[PDB]
């Protein structure tokens, strides 16, 4: 029937729903296209599906030729959201997007959720993503970094040899950033904040004293975006169904920076593994091969 | 020789700057830096030994927690209530800036601050007591800056009628582990013969975002507290017995779930917008919270070793307790 999220890895053990994954990734019109994988990952109830909903609105507006909407319009769209399932979900619709110059690529949206058996699934989405958007609340804590270090090392260990770096882009997405008078919302404030915050954390906690070097050894690019609070109506509703105008002004403004920064055709980076670009079919094969290693 | 009238005038401007420079504000009474703990006895005695309050039994309301969690904001509303009670809607009028004596106007300092003005309130039945407001602040982020935050947190717990443990959004394992530590460090100095070491503990949870799970306020906080504790015990063995530990140190444990105050408060370093610019539900819940702590029938005299303590006795405990941690 309608598009929606598909449970592809489910969590004490884990399983790949290969038939569910393959029915998405093996469709005739995207099967041999190079795939761009955008992955949002983090703990339960941190607003991952809300941000994925705006990614979809951008993708569907681009597909159907202001993507955010009129203020008076309810958010009225296919939405990503017990939701307390540990595992990986992928959007059932793969988007075909033409890059400048004419190359058409497939765009997959991925959601990784968990609270450690979750090391496997965070590793898997890291290994299979063009951009891993690590979704944190308010600040970057020692435990956020300890976990990040663990699942990136765990993913790197399932990849036998690495002539380059194992992963591509890491983005720290900091939600409900409350100190724009110290670091401005968005990318440049986020960059200045990340490096200072990592330096402070490394010096406070010997368990992550090399996390900066480790992260940089793992990822070819590391960025950070400071996102404003979305307003009390979004924050206190189990399932926000209000209108665009009921979302805080600055959140919407920063959405207009963040979302195209990730999804504009000229920002889409094809997934690479072993120094070669990966098709949708190849993605399916890698999910199968990695799942086998972790089992 | 200056004129008589000019002499009294110059003395008059002298007493004008005297009152202005000593206007009611926060007083740093216990300070840390570098480690080691210093107690400004002269400053503390000037507060607690004022003639009219020296021998009254004392009610000590303490707000405690990590930096930048809105402790001084909540203290400012407590002051508004107490100044209202003193000589007279205590919250203010909607179109007016939040005005009054403020706390953050008078800091990354680790230690304890006490409001310089002691309030005398008449309880139901006519007993007048002294009310002291205390602000306790420090980081427990790292391995360093954790021994010293335990000490000052123990100190304000030992000396308070109610310890308002001010936490953001939820009760986390690290909040419970530090609580366990500083109530342990404070327990030792108590003799524990006639009474539990401490009186009331209140988990004040700020920016509660789940009223459809547990309602804002006291009844929601109590339904939330016990079930939250059982979870954290099961997950981190270091606090596996924290609920029994809490109930052995305190004679009362409560929890209050407080709304978010609005984006204007949240993103301004020192909010000076209008009362109307504070979230409506926040103000509603404040009208429950602040009287629940400060209404005359709720003021609990400080008790140590089975006996009610006076302001002057409170000074002597601070001087004695501080030497123990040395
Ligand atoms: N404070 C805050 N709440 C949000 C944000 N985004 C979504 N929410 C709310 O937080 C709750 C959890 O959101 P959800 O998207 O389901 O989180 P997920 O479990 O990570 O997918 C819902 O009530 C959302 O309305 C945000 O940026 N900040
Ligand atoms: N999100 C949120 N912010 C608050 C709250 N109360 C105060 N603030 C803001 O948080 C920041 C720190 O508040 P402050 O009272 O100085 O924190 P303190 O260091 O614990 O005294 C200020 O910008 C306040 O305006 C609250 O309940 N929730
Ligand atoms: Mg989700
Ligand atoms: Mg303070």
Swiss-Prot record, chain B:
Location, primary (coarse class): endoplasmic reticulum
UniProt-annotated binding residues for GDP: 68-73, 104, 206-207, 265, 268
Superkingdom classification of source: Eukaryota
Tissue spec. comment: Expressed in the central nervous system and in dorsal root ganglia neurons. Expressed in peripheral tissues (at protein level).
Keywords, in A-Z order: Acetylation, Disease variant, Endoplasmic reticulum, GTP-binding, Hydrolase, Magnesium, Membrane, Neuropathy, Nucleotide-binding, Phosphoprotein, Transmembrane, Transmembrane helix
Membrane topology of this protein: Multi-pass membrane protein
Annotated ranges, domain GB1/RHD3-type G: 55-298
Gene Ontology CC annotations of this record: endoplasmic reticulum; endoplasmic reticulum membrane; endoplasmic reticulum tubular network; endoplasmic reticulum tubular network membrane; membrane
Positions annotated to bind Mg(2+): 135
Reactions that this protein is recorded to catalyse: GTP + H2O = GDP + phosphate + H(+)
GO MF entries: GTP binding; GTPase activity; GTPase-dependent fusogenic activity; identical protein binding
GO terms, biological process: endoplasmic reticulum membrane fusion; endoplasmic reticulum organization; endoplasmic reticulum tubular network membrane organization; protein homooligomerization
Cytoplasmic side: 1-326
Stretches for region N-terminal hypervariable region (HVR): 1-25
Illness the protein is tied to: Neuropathy, hereditary sensory, 1F: An autosomal dominant sensory neuropathy affecting the lower limbs. Distal sensory impairment becomes apparent during the second or third decade of life, resulting in painless ulceration of the feet with poor healing, which can progress to osteomyelitis, bone destruction, and amputation. There is no autonomic involvement, spasticity, or cognitive impairment.
Function: Atlastin-3 (ATL3) is a membrane-anchored GTPase that mediates the GTP-dependent fusion of endoplasmic reticulum (ER) membranes, maintaining the continuous ER network. It facilitates the formation of three-way junctions where ER tubules intersect. Two atlastin-3 on neighboring ER tubules bind GTP and form loose homodimers through the GB1/RHD3-type G domains and 3HB regions. Upon GTP hydrolysis, the 3HB regions tighten, pulling the membranes together to drive their fusion. After fusion, the homodimer disassembles upon release of inorganic phosphate (Pi).
Domain notes: The GB1/RHD3-type G domain mediates GTP-binding and hydrolysis as well as homodimerization. The two three-helix bundle (3HB) regions in the homodimer are loosely associated initially, but they tighten upon GTP hydrolysis, facilitating the fusion of membranes.
Full protein name: Atlastin-3
Source organism: Homo sapiens
Higher taxonomy: Eukaryota, Metazoa, Chordata, Craniata, Vertebrata
Entire protein: shown range: 1 to 333 of 541
């Amino acid at each position: 029937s309608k598009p929606g999220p598909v449970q592809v890895v489910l969590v004490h053990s884990f399983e790949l729903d290969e038939k569910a994954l393959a029915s998405i990734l093996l469709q005739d019109h995207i099967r041999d296209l190079d795939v761009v994988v955008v992955s949002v990952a983090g703990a339960f109830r941190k607003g991952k599906s809300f941000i994925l909903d705006f990614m979809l609105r951008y993708l569907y507006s681009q597909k159907e030729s202001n993507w955010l909407g009129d203020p008076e319009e309810p958010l009225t769209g296919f939405s990503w959201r017990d939701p307390e399932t540990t595992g990986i979900q992928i959007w059932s619709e793969v988007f075909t997007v033409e890059k400048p110059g004419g190359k058409k690529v497939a765009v997959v949206l991925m959601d990784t959720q968990g609270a450690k058996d979750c090391a496997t699934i965070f590793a898997l989405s890291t290994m299979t993503s063009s951009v891993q958007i690590y979704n944190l609340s308010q600040n970057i804590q020692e435990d956020d970094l300890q976990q990040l270090q663990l699942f990136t090392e765990y993913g790197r260990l399932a990849m036998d040899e690495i002539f380059q770096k194992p992963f591509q882009t890491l983005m720290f997405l900091v939600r409900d950033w409350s100190f724009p008078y110290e670091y401005s919302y968005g990318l440049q404030g986020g960059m200045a904040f990340l490096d200072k915050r990592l330096q402070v954390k490394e010096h406070q906690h010997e368990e992550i004293q090399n996390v900066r070097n480790h992260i940089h050894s793992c990822f070819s690019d590391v960025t950070c975006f400071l996102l404003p609070h979305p307003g009390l109506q979004v924050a206190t509703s189990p399932d926000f169904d209000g209108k665009l105008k009921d979302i805080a002004g600055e959140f919407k403004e920063q959405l207009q920076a963040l979302i195209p920064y990730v999804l504009n055709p000229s920002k889409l980076m094809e997934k690479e593994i072993n120094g070669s670009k990966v098709t949708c079919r190849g993605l399916l094969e890698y999910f199968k091969a990695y799942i086998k290693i972790y089992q």
